[PDB]
Amino acid sequence: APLAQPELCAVDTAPGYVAGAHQFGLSQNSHLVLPLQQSDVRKRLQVQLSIRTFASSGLIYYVAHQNQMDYATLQLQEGRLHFMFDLGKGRTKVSHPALLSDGKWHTVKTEYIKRKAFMTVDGQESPSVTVVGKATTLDVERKLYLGGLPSHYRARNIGTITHSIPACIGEIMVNGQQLDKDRPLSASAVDRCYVVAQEGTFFEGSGYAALVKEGYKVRLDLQITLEFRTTSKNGVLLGISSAKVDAIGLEIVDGKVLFHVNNGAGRITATYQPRAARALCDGKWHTLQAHKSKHRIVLTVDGNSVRAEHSTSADTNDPIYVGGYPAHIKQNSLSSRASFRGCVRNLRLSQVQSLDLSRAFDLQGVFPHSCPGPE
Ligand SMILES: [Cl-]
Ligand SMILES: [Mg+2]
Ligand SMILES: [Mg+2]
Numbered sequence: 001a002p003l004a005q006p007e008l009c010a011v012d013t014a015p016g017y018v019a020g021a022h023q024f025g026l027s028q029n030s031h032l033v034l035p036l037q038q039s040d041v042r043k044r045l046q047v048q049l050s051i052r053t054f055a056s057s058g059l060i061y062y063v064a065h066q067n068q069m070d071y072a073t074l075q076l077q078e079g080r081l082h083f084m085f086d087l088g089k090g091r092t093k094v095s096h097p098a099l100l101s102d103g104k105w106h107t108v109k110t111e112y113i114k115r116k117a118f119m120t121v122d123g124q125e126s127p128s129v130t131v132v133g134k135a136t137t138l139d140v141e142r143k144l145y146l147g148g149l150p151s152h153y154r155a156r157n158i159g160t161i162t163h164s165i166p167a168c169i170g171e172i173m174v175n176g177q178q179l180d181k182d183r184p185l186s187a188s189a190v191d192r193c194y195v196v197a198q199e200g201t202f203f204e205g206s207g208y209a210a211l212v213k214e215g216y217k218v219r220l221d222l223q224i225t226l227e228f229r230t231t232s233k234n235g236v237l238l239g240i241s242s243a244k245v246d247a248i249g250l251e252i253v254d255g256k257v258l259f260h261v262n263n264g265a266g267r268i269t270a271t272y273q274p275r276a277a278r279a280l281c282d283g284k285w286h287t288l289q290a291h292k293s294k295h296r297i298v299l300t301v302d303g304n305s306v307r308a309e310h311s312t313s314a315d316t317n318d319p320i321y322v323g324g325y326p327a328h329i330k331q332n333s334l335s336s337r338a339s340f341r342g343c344v345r346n347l348r349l350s351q352v353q354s355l356d357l358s359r360a361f362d363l364q365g366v367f368p369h370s371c372p373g374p375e
Pocket of ligand 2 (some may be wrong): 135137
């Protein structure tokens with residue numbers, strides 16, 4: 001029974017979904033395996049597709065011989081496109097300057113024809129490159145992998161960018177023919193695209209994402225930074241806990257942000273309370289910094305800091321739970337059990353390390369890299 005009428009939070013407007021489009025990158029192996037029947041790519045491979053993304057890296061498409069001696073692939077790296085193939089006796093590579101990670105739709109074309117190869121993005125064609133090697137044919141299996149690769153597949157000689165691209169892909173054509181993406185040979189972890197999206201990972205409020213199955217050790221010093229947006233007053237953000245006492249936690253309870261830490265001598269808590277109760281559930285992005293050092297704990301929200309200052313090591317050796325946690329998992333430094341609802345972006349631990357939610361080993365009600373609504 002509150003003394004004043006409750007302060008309502010902002011409201012989220014569902015954008016709906018794009019018809020005939022697929023969102024990849026939800027897991028490191030999200031993909032579609034599409035049949036190639038009428039295409040003869042031996043002397044010519046022209047692929048045209050539309051893409052929308054905020055990501056910096058990922059595999060967009062791949063085709064290869066059973067022995068992998070012949071192949072062709074399109075990958076994104078540092079926000080830019082790279083097209084390469086090997087006809088059996090040498091690799092040819094083409095790059096394009098266009099920056100694609102702006103969240104807007106782009107048309108892309110990759111072309112290998114005769115003894116030349118080139119790329120086109122939004123109509124801007126790159127200079128041609130001469131096919132390398134003596135071989136004259138691209139000999140590959142009658143199958144194209146779109147948006148990523150199967151978990152059991154081991155792609156050779158295409159570098160380390162073999163994870164699924166966090167992006168929405170529309171229709172795709174090969175040598176003038178539109179492929180029926182609705183009739184894939186097989187697939188894994190694919191979903192729909194929001195009509196309008198913004199950079200981030202959506203948490204529907206029902207589950208969580210668990211990372212680092214081998215265990216993470218907080219120890220003495222650790223810096224956690226992230227950005228979040230939400231229209232709810234309660235929600236767990238992050239927790240790393242031993243099955244005993246040592247643990248750390250970050251959560252939103254009744255409009256306030258709490259950073260708990262326990263080095264084996266009791267819970268230490270830094271609390272941030274905004275001027276307005278509904279300030280943080282306004283649907284806009286907020287920055288969050290939580291630094292743990294020897295005998296110091298500092299929580300900073302939107303530039304506002306709050307700290308608290310005899311064991312000093314948080315001896316954890318467990319997974320990192322994001323956005324919530326299941327009942328059978330102990331979280332000694334979290335008072336709440338409520339799953340977060342909203343989006344989180346730029347999650348990093350510091351010597352910096354950013355956490356990629358698409359790598360979660362256990363995921364429930366969370367959609368990495370896919371966040372609805374405009375920014
Ligand atoms: Cl100790
Ligand atoms: Mg060949
Ligand atoms: Mg200890």
